[PDB]
Amino acid sequence: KTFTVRIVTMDAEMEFNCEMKWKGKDLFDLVCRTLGLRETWFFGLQYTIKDTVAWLKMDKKVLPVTFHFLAKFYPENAEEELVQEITQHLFFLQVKKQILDEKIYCPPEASVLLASYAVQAKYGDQMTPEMWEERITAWYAEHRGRARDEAEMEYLKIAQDLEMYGVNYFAIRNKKGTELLLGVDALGLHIYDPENRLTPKISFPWNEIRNISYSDKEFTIKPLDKKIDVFKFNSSKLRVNKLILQLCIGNHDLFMRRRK
Amino acid sequence: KTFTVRIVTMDAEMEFNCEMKWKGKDLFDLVCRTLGLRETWFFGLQYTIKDTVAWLKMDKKVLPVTFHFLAKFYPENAEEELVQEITQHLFFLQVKKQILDEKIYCPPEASVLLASYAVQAKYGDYDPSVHQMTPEMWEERITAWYAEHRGRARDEAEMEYLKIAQDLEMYGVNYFAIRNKKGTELLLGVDALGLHIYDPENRLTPKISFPWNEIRNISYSDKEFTIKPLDKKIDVFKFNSSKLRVNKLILQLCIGNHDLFMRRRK
Secondary structure, three states, X not given: OEEEEEEEOXXXXXXXXXXXXXXXXXXXXXXXXXXXXXXXXXXEEEEEEOOEEEEOOOOOEOXXXXXEEEEOOOOOOHHHHOOOHHHHHHHHHHHHHHHHOOOOOOOHHHHHHHHHHHHHHHOOOOEOHHHHHHHHHHHHHHOOOOOOOHHHHHHHHHHOOOOOOOOEEEEEEEOOOOEEEEEEOOOEEEEEOOOOOOOOOEEEEHHHEEEEEEEOOEEEEXXXXXXXXXXXXXXXXXXXXXHHHHHHHHHHHHHHHHOO | XXXXXXXXXXXXXXXXXXXXXXXXXXXXXXXXXXXXXXXXXXXXXXXXXXXXXXXXXXXXEOOOEEEEEEEOOOOOOHHHHOOOHHHHHHHHHHHHHHHHOOOOOOOHHHHHHHHHHHHHHHHOOOOOOOOOEOHHHHHHHHHHHHXXXXXXXXXXXXXXXHHHHOOOOOOOOEEEEEEEOOOOEEEEEEOOOEEEEEOOOOOOOOOEEEEHHHEEEEEEEOOEXXXXXXXXXXXXXXXXXXXXXXXXXXXXXXXXXXXXXXXXXX
């Protein structure tokens, strides 16, 4: 009737009883409901095929099975978009790991400022009738509930202004065979020199892209403006190319919703 | 340092690395932060000594170690008090288990209503039925993504479940076997409203009720409890409980429920 699934969040190693005939969406929505999470479009269940990132399909049946509950997509504006504390918390921990691992470049002042908010996010600080009265008074102060962790939001507001924040990088080659990087993020598609992940050479905002097409390892970005040339590029791995397109669709659509 | 702690919820398991010198409050607040839970006063970390329910102390150091994250206290009004969905969800699962186990008596009509809301709470949330790339393919994959990714709705069916459940006489009552000074075998009910004395052959309607606002004090000394009412016309109620671990639990539930009762009356 059910089988055990290990779900790893940034917080904990969790275990769920997944029904035999359940699809990816049923397992995913169980995890979300467990964490009281409604802002679910950011998240997915990740695993690795060979050495590539893979995200669990929501329409396929799920079949110690292990997935990582992670953000696939990032907000453009953390304060406006992360309304629930759980979403703020999960983003905070994922972004902080990327800061500490130096996956996101961070300048010295931002480093010490982020570190200070992380410190604040880490730390929140017989019976006689007379004993009954003392135990009444003591209980009120001891049981008032957790305050919302505003430091986590202050952290994300600094982090989101970093050039490398929420950018997915992929090694690519243009039609001349020049090695470059592709950045897929909230704002659009970006082409980088391989030795500068901070400042793109070219940017294609999602509103300025007529279409993207993919055939036989070649991507084509068709801009909305006919004065701007089409950008064709190559990526060698097919499993990586499927991931790029997944991130293009999601980020495009979340971009459009943010513009009402 | 650290040691592994298993935290079992109502339908999931989570493992945490608990620091050696950490107190119960450190471990408890880590679990609450993991679930994004701020309405924490309802909850505790439960374990069992011999066959009795025990709750982990927040000032004592924590020392496969397993605790159950459960509600120790119940709201008087679920809709008003369970503002966060997580709190609603955790109460829904705990109360549903008590309904299905028949720990809370439920009449047949309420039971089939509860079962219908449980179906809707299970899937209605995200499923309204309740259980190469060409430029043209790019356009189709854009349009398909919007409908496929809408977010989870607040699981309102759970609140509807709790609103039916909270009107059941046995809901949120902690029962304890007790004897009065004449030696009559009776039950003590500890709940959000006060203390209740039951005939053992009727857990639904109490013989005597002492509302928390109408209790001057409670005292306990060596197996015997004393309820002193506020009104001097009402006699003091003395009763006996045989098990010492059960008596520590009774007093814990008396203090918490008394204090939550008073906060609700501002």
